[PDB]
Design a protein around this ligand. Structure first.
Ligand SMILES: NC(=O)C1=CN([C@@H]2O[C@H](COP(=O)(O)OP(=O)(O)OC[C@H]3O[C@@H](n4cnc5c(N)ncnc54)[C@H](O)[C@@H]3O)[C@@H](O)[C@H]2O)C=CC1
Ligand SMILES: NC(=O)C1=CN([C@@H]2O[C@H](COP(=O)(O)OP(=O)(O)OC[C@H]3O[C@@H](n4cnc5c(N)ncnc54)[C@H](O)[C@@H]3O)[C@@H](O)[C@H]2O)C=CC1
Ligand SMILES: CCCCC[C@H](C)NC=O
Ligand SMILES: CCCCC[C@H](C)NC=O
Ligand SMILES: [Zn+2]
Ligand SMILES: [Zn+2]
Ligand SMILES: [Zn+2]
Ligand SMILES: [Zn+2]
Lengths: 374, 374
């Protein structure tokens, strides 16, 4: 009944850096050509949403953030062919156009239509579907899931299994897939290897799950919050280390523990110093280090290139290297077939209107993923 | 007739940084257990030897430098099994002990017995076989080929074909194998790809040869010395670019020429700034950049890790990634079957006694490889 009409609903608007989210009455325009309007069912709180608040990640304000979500298609614009009203969907913060050089490459996933590299905070057409008191509100990563309803470009949504539990599979929209893919697809962890994972939040726990799936023999978790260690061990870490416990740098500790360096390391925090530490702790001749965490805007790291000359490989990726529209439905099917677990990532469930409590939980160190429900 | 005896012979001794080599009489001890004494036939002048003179590359002085060479075994110490007197050999600046975790790894080649990481300038046993003016003189990379005779550990020498032309195949001891392998083994250049090669000296020309062998569609040579371009095109470059000809930074120029970034880039100079430029010019989602050049001692580069987070891979390697003792004889056999060419690398030939003129030819830009004959 709402098709082709403006919807008035609630959304969490970020008006200013370093402020709480403000629950506002917003107007959500109907979808234009090749757009899809989605009724939200569940959305996770990811550290990257917090990075918008903290100024770590720069995107145009005011904004409706949120990017890790699942919902049901309310309506489709002209020319949409990949979803229909009533379909369960996951919005894709990294699109898959299918036509750019990256989409056509076997390995590449950072589609050229992304809004990550040079954020505009709009739909593909350069406009917004959201107003608050007549003021346009920016989109975030072409998703904007902290709203009862959102509009996304067709290249930024995937149809998923009709029977999937949206309150769990929302994590496939970001954290789970990112960490898991970073292990299994980007690093290509090998059986019997030794892995070190820096950061034991939702993404890092998903890296651990991927290293375990890949058959790693040792998975060393590293975090300054020792409260994170029990869950890390539950999902496959063989050992955990707190850098604060040592009188020496942790790269030296990990090199000694691993008898000369790890096979694979992962930076899953977003600090420059830990990126260099994680590179250094992999074995100098054949080690691989993958950057997953997102650091503060515009800051360069300093490193000695001899770390690379000896033979190390250093790489990064977005969304675990997964081609998003192809991969999301397959990951949901794998979940439904019991190939991996999502419940270990979910520590809190709150109604949407308690969004700020959810962020307070993340910032305090107490949660992994809070799922917001509608 | 010299077996078991100290040999008095000529060598090029480097007493101090930023001074000419001194050709003078040295004493060369006989080989101890598991060591091999070699009569030099030919040695190339590699930019790395110049780096030792300049202080870019730190190694203990005084020293007998030289590491790209071929010769004939004069005598063997007790226990040597892999070469015999009269065998043609190439000394290996990267050893292959066969026993350490790196040697056992399928992809590693930076054997833990190397003298590169923390140079001592000795034999494996921590002593020197060279005396000059009554003083011990350091070895260089376990090779020291700027001498009529040298002594090397058995793990630092490979037996080659008895019919090998030593005045050509000395380049398999460093520059050819390094560049070729950086393309074919480390980057794994693919058929139909676009490559950019920064630096068109002997190593960069060898990278081009490897890219061409791998079936690259486009190979863009980059050098500030346009006199290098003609030879780069002869060996496979499809285009050459001089950064000094352009108002834009060369990474922008290359990204444009390649319709969004190259598949593979190679830094084959030894400058921090070109390492970051080369990384930048590869395609942000799936590009690979390999560091080959050696930059000034102890200096760090500065870079933005967003360059990696989008999907780039950055790596480096010593000796083209080749496991040295296994690979060198096979490369020589391939050269004898005319699978690649060395003559394009050899621009000048001089007697050993004219070593300082050879270094002048390199420093002035005029040469690729000068081969010194004994
Ligand atoms: N590359 C990509 O596609 C994606 C990247 N991200 C990024 O991944 C990172 C992790 O995200 P979440 O797991 O949601 O975050 P999180 O905040 O839940 O987890 C980070 C962990 O790092 C630990 N930590 C913080 N400082 C540390 C230090 N100095 N040393 C050791 N441990 C430290 C924390 O205690 C925490 O447990 C964030 O930077 C986020 O923006 C997240 C998803 C997608
Ligand atoms: N990784 C390894 O195992 C090995 C590394 N090396 C290193 O590889 C590098 C190259 O060695 P060679 O080919 O013998 O040296 P080379 O000096 O003959 O060639 C370097 C080229 O770079 C060009 N160049 C200088 N500054 C430039 C700039 N700003 N932009 C563009 N081009 C520039 C020069 O004009 C020259 O043609 C050296 O740093 C050497 O130490 C060499 C062999 C082994
Ligand atoms: C402004 C770009 C931010 C992208 C953040 C991260 C890669 N995505 C999801 O957490
Ligand atoms: C003291 C370490 C120098 C290594 C130099 C380079 C990798 N080898 C030959 O050119
Ligand atoms: Zn695309
Ligand atoms: Zn996220
Ligand atoms: Zn060399
Ligand atoms: Zn070894």
């Amino acid at each position: 009944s709402t098709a082709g009409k403006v919807i008035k609903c609630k959304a969490a608007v970020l008006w200013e850096e370093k402020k709480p989210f403000s629950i506002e009455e917003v107007e959500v325009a109907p979808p234009k050509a090749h757009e899809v309007r989605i009724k939200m069912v569940a959305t996770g709180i990811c550290r990257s949403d917090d990075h918008v608040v903290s100024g770590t990640l720069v995107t145009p304000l005011p904004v409706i953030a949120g990017h890790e979500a699942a919902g049901i298609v309310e309506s489709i614009g002209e020319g949409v062919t990949t979803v229909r009203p009533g379909d369960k969907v996951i919005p894709l913060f990294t699109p898959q156009c299918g036509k750019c050089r990256v989409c056509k490459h076997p390995e590449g996933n950072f589609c050229l239509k992304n809004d990550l590299s040079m954020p505009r905070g709009t739909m593909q057409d350069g406009t917004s579907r959201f107003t608050c008191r007549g003021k346009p509100i920016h989109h975030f990563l072409g998703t904007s899931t902290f709203s009862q309803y959102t509009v996304v470009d067709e290249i930024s949504v995937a149809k998923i299994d009709a029977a999937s539990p949206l309150e769990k599979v929302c994590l496939i929209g970001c954290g789970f897939s990112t960490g898991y893919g970073s292990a299994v697809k980007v690093a290509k962890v090998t059986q019997g290897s030794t892995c070190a994972v820096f950061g034991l939040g939702g993404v890092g726990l998903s890296v651990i799950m991927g290293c375990k799936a890949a058959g790693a023999a040792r998975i060393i978790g590293v975090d300054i919050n020792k409260d994170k260690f029990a869950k890390a061990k539950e999902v496959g870490a063989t050992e955990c280390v707190n850098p604060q416990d040592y009188k020496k740098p942790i790269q030296e500790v990990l090199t000694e523990m691993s008898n000369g360096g790890v096979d694979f390391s992962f930076e899953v925090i977003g600090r420059l110093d830990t990126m260099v530490t994680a590179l250094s702790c992999c074995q100098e001749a054949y080690g691989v280090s993958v950057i997953v965490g997102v650091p503060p805007d515009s800051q360069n790291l300093s490193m000695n290139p001899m770390l690379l000359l000896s033979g190390r490989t250093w790489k990064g990726a977005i969304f675990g290297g997964f081609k998003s529209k192809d991969s999301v439905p397959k990951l949901v099917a794998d979940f439904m077939a019991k190939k991996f677990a999502l419940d270990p990532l979910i520590t809190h469930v709150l109604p949407f209107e308690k969004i700020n409590e959810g962020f307070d939980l993340l910032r305090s160190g107490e949660s992994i993923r809070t799922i917001l429900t509608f």
